[PDB]
Structure formats: C-alpha cells, structure tokens
Amino acid sequence: TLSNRAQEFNRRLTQKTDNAPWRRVVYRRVDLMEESNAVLYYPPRPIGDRKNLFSTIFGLINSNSLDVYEYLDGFEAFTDQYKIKFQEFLDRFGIYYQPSTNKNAELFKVADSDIPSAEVKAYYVKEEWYFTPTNSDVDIKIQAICPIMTGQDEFGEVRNQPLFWIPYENIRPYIARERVMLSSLNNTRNSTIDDFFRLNLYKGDIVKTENLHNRALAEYCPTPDSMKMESKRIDKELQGFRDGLFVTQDTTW
Amino acid sequence: GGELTGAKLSSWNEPSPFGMIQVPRGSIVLGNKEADSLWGIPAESRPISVDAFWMDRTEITNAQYRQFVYYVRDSIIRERLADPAYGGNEEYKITENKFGEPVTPHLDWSKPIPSEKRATEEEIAAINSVYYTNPVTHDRKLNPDQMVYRYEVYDYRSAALREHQLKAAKRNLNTDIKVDPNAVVMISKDTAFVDESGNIISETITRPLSSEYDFLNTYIVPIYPDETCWVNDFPNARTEIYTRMYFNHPGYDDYPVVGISWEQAQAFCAWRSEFFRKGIRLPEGQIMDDFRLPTEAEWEYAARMGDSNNKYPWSTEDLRTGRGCFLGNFKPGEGDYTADGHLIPSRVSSFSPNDFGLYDMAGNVAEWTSTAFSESGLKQMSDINPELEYKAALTDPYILKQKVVRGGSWKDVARFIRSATRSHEYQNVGRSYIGFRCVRTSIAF
Amino acid sequence: GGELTGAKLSSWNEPSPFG
Numbered sequence: 140t141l142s143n144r145a146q147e148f149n150r151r152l153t154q155k156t157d158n159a160p161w162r163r164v165v166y167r168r169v170d171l172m173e174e175s176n177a178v179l180y181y182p183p184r185p186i187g188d189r190k191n192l193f194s195t196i197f198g199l200i201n202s203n204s205l206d207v208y209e210y211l212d213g214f215e216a217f218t219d220q221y222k223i224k225f226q227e228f229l230d231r232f233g234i235y236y237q238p239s240t241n242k243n244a245e246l247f248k249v250a251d252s253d254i255p256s257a258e259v260k261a262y263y264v265k266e267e268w269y270f271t272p273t274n275s276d277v278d279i280k281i282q283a284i285c286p287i288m289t290g291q292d293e294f295g296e297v298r299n300q301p302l303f304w305i306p307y308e309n310i311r312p313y314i315a316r317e318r319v320m321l322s323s324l325n326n327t328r329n330s331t332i333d334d335f336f337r338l339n340l341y342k343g344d345i346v347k348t349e350n351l352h353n354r355a356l357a358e359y360c361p362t363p364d365s366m367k368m369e370s371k372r373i374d375k376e377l378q379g380f381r382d383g384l385f386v387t388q389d390t391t392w
Numbered sequence: 393g394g395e396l397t398g399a400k401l402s403s404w405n406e407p408s409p410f411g412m413i414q415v416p417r418g419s420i421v422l423g424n425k426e427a428d429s430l431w432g433i434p435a436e437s438r439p440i441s442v443d444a445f446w447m448d449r450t451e452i453t454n455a456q457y458r459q460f461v462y463y464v465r466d467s468i469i470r471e472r473l474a475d476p477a478y479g480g481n482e483e484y485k486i487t488e489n490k491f492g493e494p495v496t497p498h499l500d501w502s503k504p505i506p507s508e509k510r511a512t513e514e515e516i517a518a519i520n521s522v523y524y525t526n527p528v529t530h531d532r533k534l535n536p537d538q539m540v541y542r543y544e545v546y547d548y549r550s551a552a553l554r555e556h557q558l559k560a561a562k563r564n565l566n567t568d569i570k571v572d573p574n575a576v577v578m579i580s581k582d583t584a585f586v587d588e589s590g591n592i593i594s595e596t597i598t599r600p601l602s603s604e605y606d607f608l609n610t611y612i613v614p615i616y617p618d619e620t621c622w623v624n625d626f627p628n629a630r631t632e633i634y635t636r637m638y639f640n641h642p643g644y645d646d647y648p649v650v651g652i653s654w655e656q657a658q659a660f661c662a663w664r665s666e667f668f669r670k671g672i673r674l675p676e677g678q679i680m681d682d683f684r685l686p687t688e689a690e691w692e693y694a695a696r697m698g699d700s701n702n703k704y705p706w707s708t709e710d711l712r713t714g715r716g717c718f719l720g721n722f723k724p725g726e727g728d729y730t731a732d733g734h735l736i737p738s739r740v741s742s743f744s745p746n747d748f749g750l751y752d753m754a755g756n757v758a759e760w761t762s763t764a765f766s767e768s769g770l771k772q773m774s775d776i777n778p779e780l781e782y783k784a785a786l787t788d789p790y791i792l793k794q795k796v797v798r799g800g801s802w803k804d805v806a807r808f809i810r811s812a813t814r815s816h817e818y819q820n821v822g823r824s825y826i827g828f829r830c831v832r833t834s835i836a837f
Numbered sequence: 838g839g840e841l842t843g844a845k846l847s848s849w850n851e852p853s854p855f856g
C-alpha cells in the first residue's frame with residue numbers, strides 16, 4: 140500500500156533512543172475532561188465516520204489489526220503471553236456482543252451504545268525523556284497508552300479500571316490518518332492524533348516514574364493534594380535537567 | 393620522510409552571486425511562544441541553528457523568470473532547427489570537434505537563430521512550432537505545453553546514507569551482525585522521457601540498489617507560468633486583466649512572478665545553477681553548491697534577522713512607521729487591500745529592507761520553501777541546518793505532496809505575514825499570491 | 838551564461854482617453 144518513498148520517509152521520521160546517555164520513564168494520567176485533552180474524546184460516540192481515539196482502538200481490535208496487552212499492576216509486558224484475547228475482554232468488562240456476520244474485520248458484533256467510547260475518560264501515557272548523543276537535545280518518545288473506563292463502582296463510589304496497554308508503534312500508522320480538531324474555538328480538522336501525541340499537546344499528572352524500588356506515586360502520596368505536589372516536584376526535576384544542560388543564560392561572568 | 397607538514401590544497405575563488413546578500417550563521421527560536429487563543433492554534437517553538445548562505449535580495453520578478461522561459465524557448469527552437477522533421481540544418485547541433493573526433497552532440501549557441509523576416513520556410517516552421525495562435529483572437533503566444541525543461545539532480549545525501557552503501561559489507565559496522573547475501577535494498581528514483589508521440593512520460597522507478605544511477609532523478613517539467621490563477625483564485629471578480637497582462641506587460645517586469653508551482657521553482661533553480669556554472673572559470677577541484685529554494689528554517693531565520701525578539705522583518709512590533717506608513721504590502725483592513733498603497737503585488741523594493749538587506753519577506757507574495765509540510769515538522773527536523781525533505785512518488789496520495797510556504801502575500805491578514813506563521817500548498821499548484829526566491833550555501837571560513 | 842539579469846519587455850505607450 141505504502142510507496143517505497145513513504146516507507147523510507149517514515150523510517151527516517153522515527154525517534155531513536157538507543158545510545159542516549161540520559162533517560163527517564165514517566166507514567167502520566169491524561170484526563171479527557173480538560174480542554175486541550177478532549178481531543179482524544181470528541182466525539183464521545185461516533186458521528187457518521189467521526190470517531191474518538193477509543194472508538195478507533197475498539198474498531199481495530201474488532202479486526203485482527205491491533206495487538207493490545209493486559210494491564211498489570213506494577214510492570215508492562217508486551218509479550219505473546221500477555222496478549223489480550225478479545226473474547227475474554229467484553230465479558231470481563233461486561234460489553235454486550237453478538238456473533239459476527241463475517242469473520243473478516245469482525246470478530247464479534249458490538250453496538251455503538253455498548254462500546255465505552257464515552258465512558259473511557261482518561262488515558263495512561265508512558266513517556267520516555269531522552270538525551271540524544273549526536274545532537275545533544277532532549278526529546279520525549281511515547282511508549283504506550285492505556286484507556287481508563289470511568290464506569291460507576293458497584294455498591295457505590297466511582298471505580299476507574301485501566302483496560303490494556305497499546306504499544307504506540309502498533310497504533311501509530313492508524314492514528315496518523317484520522318484528522319481531528321485541536322480546539323473548541325477552531326473546529327478545523329487540521330491535525331491528527333499522531334500530531335497531538337508527537338507535539339506533546341496533552342496535559343497529564345505524573346502518576347509513576349521508573350525508579351529502583353518500582354514505587355508508584357500512590358504508594359507514598361495518600362491525599363490527592365500530595366499527589367499533585369509530587370507530580371509538580373518531578374516535573375520540576377525534568378525541567379531542571381533540561382535547563383542545566385545549557386549555560387547560555389548565565390550572566391555571572 | 394621528516395616532520396608532519398601539511399598537504400595544502402589549491403586555493404579556490406568564491407564568486408559572490410549577483411542580486412544576493414549574505415546571511416551569516418546563527419541561531420533562532422523558530423515559531424512564537426504565545427498563541428492567539430482566538431485562532432485555536434497552539435504555539436509551537438523550537439530553537440535551531442543555521443550556517444551562512446546567500447539569499448536573493450528580492451523575490452523573483454517577471455523578467456527574471458522570463459529569462460528562463462526564453463532560454464527554454466530558444467533551446468527547443470534550436471533543437472528543432474537541426475532536426476530532419478522540421479528543418480535539417482546540422483549547424484545547430486555540433487557532433488564533432490574541429491579535428492573530427494566524435495563528441496557529445498550539443499547545441500551551437502554561437503550562431504544566431506534566424507530572424508522571422510529573414511528566415512526560410514523550414515526555419516520559419518521550426519520557429520513557429522513552439523508558438524500557438526488563438527483561432528478566434530488571432531493572438532500568438534508561446535505554447536505552454538511546448539515550454540518544457542529537462543534536468544537531472546543527483547541525490548548526494550541518499551547516496552551518502554549508510555544503508556545505501558553499494559557494498560553490502562559496508563552497510564553495517566557492527567561486527568556481531570553478518571551481512572545476509574540475500575538481503576536486498578529497494579531504492580526509488582524519478583525518470584522522465586519524451587516518447588515518439590511527443591508526450592512526456594514521468595515515472596518513479598523502484599528497484600534493488602545496484603549502482604550510482606539509482607541516485608539520479610530526471611524531470612521534464614512544463615515551466616510556463618500559470619496565468620489563469622488570477623481568474624481561478626478569485627471567483628466573482630474582474631481579475632482576467634491580470635491573467636492577460638501581469639506576466640506580459642512591460643510595466644510589471646519588476647513585479648514578483650506568480651502562478652509558479654513548487655516543481656517549476658525547482659526547475660528554475662536548476663536552470664539557474666547550470667547557467668551560472670556555464671559562465672564561470674573554476675580551478676581544478678573547486679566544488680560549488682547549486683541554487684535552491686530555502687528551507688523553512690533558513691527562511692524564518694533570514695526574515696527575522698536572526699533575532700528571536702522579532703515577529704516581523706523589522707525591529708518594531710507595530711505594522712506602520714511613526715508617520716502611519718505600512719511596512720509591507722498585505723491586506724490591512726477588512727476588504728481593504730489598498731491601505732498600504734497596493735491592491736495586487738507591487739514592484740520589488742517598494743518598502744524598507746531588512747537589517748540583512750532583504751525586501752518583501754513579509755507580504756507581497758508568499759514564498760515557496762523546499763521543506764515538506766508536516767503538522768509536527770518542527771519537532772521532527774534536526775537542530776542543525778533543519779530540513780524535512782520528501783521526494784513524493786507519482787502514485788503517492790495527493791496529501792503527501794504539500795510544501796511549506798512562508799511570508800504572507802498581498803491578500804493576507806497581518807497574522808499570516810508574521811514570520812513564524814506556516815502555510816502550505818500542493819507542489820503542482822500555482823497561485824496569484826505565491827512567488828519565491830533562491831538561496832545558495834556559502835563556503836565561508 | 839552568467840548571472841540572473843532580466844528579460845525585459847518592450848515599453849508601451851498608454852493613451853489617455855478623451856473625455
């Protein structure tokens with residue numbers, strides 16, 4: 140389908156972090172109920188050929204065109220042992236489905252009202268900040284994303300269940316073609332989900348960081364205010380690394 | 393032997409191009425750090441560094457492009473004169489030297505073309521073969537379908553890629569990895585030719601990498617300006633006068649050329665490089681760089697005078713001088729193009745230049761760059777000499793053939809004449825508000 | 838060849854219409 144020129148260009152447009160002298164993995168929670176974050180949310184339910192990010196993910200999974208992996212509590216394993224079986228996901232999260240009319244591009248039959256495109260209201264983003272050795276610049280590479288269904292908790296209270304991990308390389312080709320609008324004040328669909336992620340237009344709070352104890356911010360920040368404070372502290376650490384890289388604004392000479 | 397002296401090379405001579413100013417190496421933060429918040433467009437900024445280069449003082453004018461058009465016309469006429477089909481005069485195509493040794497056939501530009509009044513029937517037919525007369529209006533103009541320019545470009549960067557080494561053993565310096573004998577590298581190139589029927593056949597060839605010819609791209613491009621743009625760009629307007637006179641009136645000679653597509657601009661740059669090389673004497677070993685369209689990073693650096701505090705190609709943050717005179721030719725008022733004195737483009741150098749010495753980097757006509765357009769293109773380019781180069785395949789989707797445009801034009805609002813604003817256009821599309829200027833890498837120490 | 842001069846056109850005379 141793709142031409143040779145396009146393949147070469149795409150392989151030239153991939154970020155490489157192989158020999159980076161510095162690295163840092165950060166797990167952020169992106170809330171779709173915020174402006175500049177609802178780009179992944181609109182439309183909550185499909186409008187003709189318009190779907191939000193989770194609708195596209197669910198559609199690709201309905202075919203055999205997307206491999207997603209189970210959300211484990213502590214680590215990410217994108218191996219065949221953890222590959223998600225679609226059949227034992229709808230029953231697990233109670234999504235109504237029927238036998239399909241054709242096994243091609245359709246594993247089952249799911250109505251739009253069944254698909255939690257509007258209930259999925261948050262995402263997990265696994266960023267990797269890296270320092271390029273040849274260029275001496277700091278960049279961010281997205282490793283994986285994970286939708287969070289916000290369905291009500293049984294017996295009361297709200298329960299947020301992460302669904303599964305989507306390796307970003309697996310979904311990148313599909314989300315580079317669907318144009319979206321990046322604002323409510325300008326409805327032109329002049330961008331894509333891939334541009335939204337590559338430009339780091341999402342705003343999330345750091346919920347985890349790759350450390351030597353495998354600790355998550357929740358394990359030592361009881362109150363939400365403390366969690367926000369810790370996220371601010373870690374963001375300050377990253378920005379301070381970037382600032383300390385360079386000395387062109389030091390006037391103590 | 394002895395001590396370690398140096399094997400100095402032979403001193404070269406650098407010819408400073410005419411009509412060009414020098415832009416020094418430096419750094420700038422491309423983009424703006426604040427957004428409008430009413431355009432709904434997030435602000436993107438990226439610091440980059442560029443090397444020194446020569447940049448055209450003004451945008452290419454109608455006469456400057458007419459020189460290219462006239463060269464193409466004269467070359468085609470000479471090719472037809474020394475042709476049995478039209479004429480047959482061998483004196484217009486040299487095939488042997490003064491000693492009889494076979495050589496590369498080429499045109500004899502010394503002998504003048506026959507004058508129409510003094511030309512014979514065959515010469516007159518050859519001369520008229522490149523013209524076209526309207527049967528209704530009886531107007532004789534150069535045939536756009538005959539004004540085609542042929543040129544080749546060698547892809548030095550692709551040939552230098554490690555994955556494209558002609559020897560398989562040299563494509564991987566990791567000794568742990570053994571070079572597969574079956575491994576094949578697929579390369580794409582462009583070729584074009586004129587068939588016996590006279591139609592131009594252009595194609596993208598994909599084949600295994602085997603030789604240096606895999607890195608040569610050949611183009612035959614119709615280069616006559618698209619004058620109908622004036623009518624097509626503005627429905628329900630009386631703009632056919634410009635479609636008839638803008639490129640053909642002597643009073644518009646110094647106005648920027650419009651209706652030129654990205655491919656035609658590249659062809660003009662190649663012709664300019666060849667023309668410049670033909671008329672200079674270069675010592676053995678001397679190597680020069682060719683004229684080219686600027687990169688969007690280079691253009692933005694030159695427009696803002698290498699200063700990150702400038703939004704426009706002038707120091708002040710306003711759009712008028714202290715006396716109320718506008719600093720460029722754009723659309724300042726609602727339905728009010730003429731507030732600055734000009735409705736359509738104006739004569740180049742009608743306003744004050746840059747600190748670098750460049751005119752009309754804001755307004756007049758927006759200018760082609762060599763960068764392929766991408767929404768996240770600023771993040772995907774390099775830190776040094778940033779460039780996003782794409783040679784689209786012919787059978788590629790149309791969406792992949794967009795190139796970045798910079799500067800703003802006579803029909804743009806003040807937002808789009810800001811040096812950091814990016815527009816785009818398809819590579820085969822010409823507009824009545826897009827021109828271009830050329831750049832040349834300068835070897836300076 | 839040489840540098841990029843211009844291929845100028847032949848100047849025209851503009852008549853001023855009567856009345």
Ligand SMILES: *[C@H]1O[C@H](CO)[C@@H](O[C@@H]2O[C@@H](C)[C@H](O)[C@@H](O)[C@H]2O)[C@H](O)[C@@H]1O[C@H]1O[C@H](C(=O)O)[C@@H](O[C@H]2O[C@H](CO)[C@@H](O[C@@H]3O[C@@H](C)[C@@H](O)[C@@H](O)[C@@H]3O)[C@H](O)[C@H]2O)[C@H](O)[C@H]1O
Nearest residue numbers: 463464467468471496497498499500540541542586612670
């Ligand atoms: C003039 O240009 C038009 C294109 O606009 C050509 O017309 C095309 O081709 C004709 C046959 C068809 O009607 C259409 O396809 C049409 O689009 C037309 O043929 C002319 O260009 C051609 O002839 C030129 C010429 O005879 O001067 C060529 O000039 C250049 O190429 C020479 C190739 O050897 C080159 O010589 C070489 O380099 C020099 C520096 C020296 O080392 C010498 O020994 C080498 O052989 C000339 O210097 C160039 O000027 C032109 O390439 C060619 O397309």
Ligand SMILES: *[C@H]1O[C@H](CO)[C@@H](O[C@@H]2O[C@@H](C)[C@H](O)[C@@H](O)[C@H]2O)[C@H](O)[C@@H]1O[C@H]1O[C@H](C(=O)O)[C@@H](O[C@H]2O[C@H](CO)[C@@H](O[C@@H]3O[C@@H](C)[C@@H](O)[C@@H](O)[C@@H]3O)[C@H](O)[C@H]2O)[C@H](O)[C@H]1O
Nearest residue numbers: 544581582583584585586587595597603605606608609610
């Ligand atoms: C682009 O490609 C077409 C062919 O697809 C070229 O040929 C034209 O197309 C045909 C259909 C028409 O009859 C004519 O118009 C004809 O001229 C066209 O000119 C363009 O050619 C360019 O690309 C070629 C390519 O990529 O194949 C270049 O390489 C070819 O020419 C070389 C000339 O030396 C040739 O090398 C010679 O032959 C080989 C077998 C070997 O003996 C070697 O030592 C010889 O020098 C290459 O193998 C060819 O591939 C071509 O030069 C270039 O203009």
Ligand SMILES: *[C@H]1O[C@H](CO)[C@@H](O)[C@H](O)[C@@H]1O
Nearest residue numbers: 359360364365366368369
């Ligand atoms: C809130 O306070 C607790 C206790 O000091 C911290 O662990 C947490 O990081 C946040 O600052």
Ligand SMILES: [Ca+2]
Nearest residue numbers: 752755756757
């Ligand atoms: Ca301009």
